[PDB]
Copies of this chain bind each other. A is one copy, B any other.
Amino acid sequence: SKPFTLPILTLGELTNSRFPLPIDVLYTNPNESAIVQCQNGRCTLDGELQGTTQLLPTGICAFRGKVTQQVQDEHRGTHWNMTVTNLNGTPFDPTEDVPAPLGTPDFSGQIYGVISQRNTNTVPGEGNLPANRAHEAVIATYSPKFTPKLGNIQFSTWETQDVSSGQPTKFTPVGLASVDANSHFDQWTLPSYSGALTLNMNLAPSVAPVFPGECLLFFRSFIPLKGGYGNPAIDCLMPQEWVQHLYQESAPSLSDVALVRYVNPETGRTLFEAKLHRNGFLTVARNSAGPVVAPTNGYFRFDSWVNQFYTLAPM
């Protein structure tokens, strides 16, 4: 009977659940043709994590593992294969009912970040301390060599030789390498977690409005670029702090839809209302695409459990 609640956090106090970025704006895009089925930032209102979702902000689009060897690839750069474990260092068991190790990226693109290594072996003359190195790196999640569900991925570097075989390796995500057509950025296209031509499994379900006039409402962040033109964004269904809150609370869901109000604390006024659905996503009554222009002190407050029949006041 534990009452359902959301944390009290302005947009300026929230972070994206699909890439390590602050939330910049609320956003809608009603004419989206893609199926929306992201795998990070997936949590039911009663606290069940789904997809590849995990709790750490540092785990989103991160990998841990070991480089095996440099490998040939037709594409530009120097390429390296790495085995991947769970983020906690334990071996990834492909028989677990998840799509891929938790935290694995959930979109097609060239993810830019830093690969770092801290050697296992230490040197006596260096105070029994290990050698280290880090370099910029790109992981193309659409590559046939992106196979995290099989425990292996590949990354490329500008650096031509200074990556060590057999050593503990971390990928820290930073942004995208490019959003040119040839870099295949599509935030709603899932990677093939086991490779070219295989079917993904254990997915969090797709989400959609079902009531006429309603559209999804997203928490949008702008993602950095290594180069080229663009202002790319990543849209999540709920911020990471909501994932963290719902997981902690695990309040029973008393219907399939929670009515929430976006409120301005100063005025006490409701700016608009939204449906927060059981599977963990928002809809609003809006007939346009683009940002929601709202006071910076605003946040969502739980109002009451309603049902799928409920008619939202238009934004």
Contact = CB atoms under 8 A, between A and B. Distances in A.
Interface of A: 7-9, 12-15, 20-22, 55-59, 87-88, 112, 114, 116, 118, 122-123, 126-134, 136, 170, 172, 174-175, 222, 224-231, 240-241, 244, 248, 296
Q: Number of copies of this chain in the oligomer?
A: 2
A250 to B, nearest CB: 10
29 contacts: A13-B56, A15-B56, A22-B59, A57-B57, A57-B58, A57-B240, A114-B136, A114-B174, A114-B175, A114-B224, A116-B175, A116-B224, A116-B225, A116-B226, A129-B231, A130-B229, A130-B230, A130-B231, A132-B225, A132-B226, A132-B227, A132-B230, A133-B225, A133-B226, A134-B225, A134-B226, A134-B227, A172-B175, A241-B244
Contacts of A9: 55
B20 A57 contact: yes
Contacts of A222: 118
A276 B157 CA distance: 45
A83 to B, nearest CB: 19
Given A20-B20, A132-B229, A229-B127, A12 B88 contact: yes
A55 to B, nearest CB: 5
B129 A172 contact: no
Nearest to A119: B229
A134 B22 contact: no
Nearest to A224: B116
A15 B225 contact: no
Contacts of A175: 114, 116, 134, 172
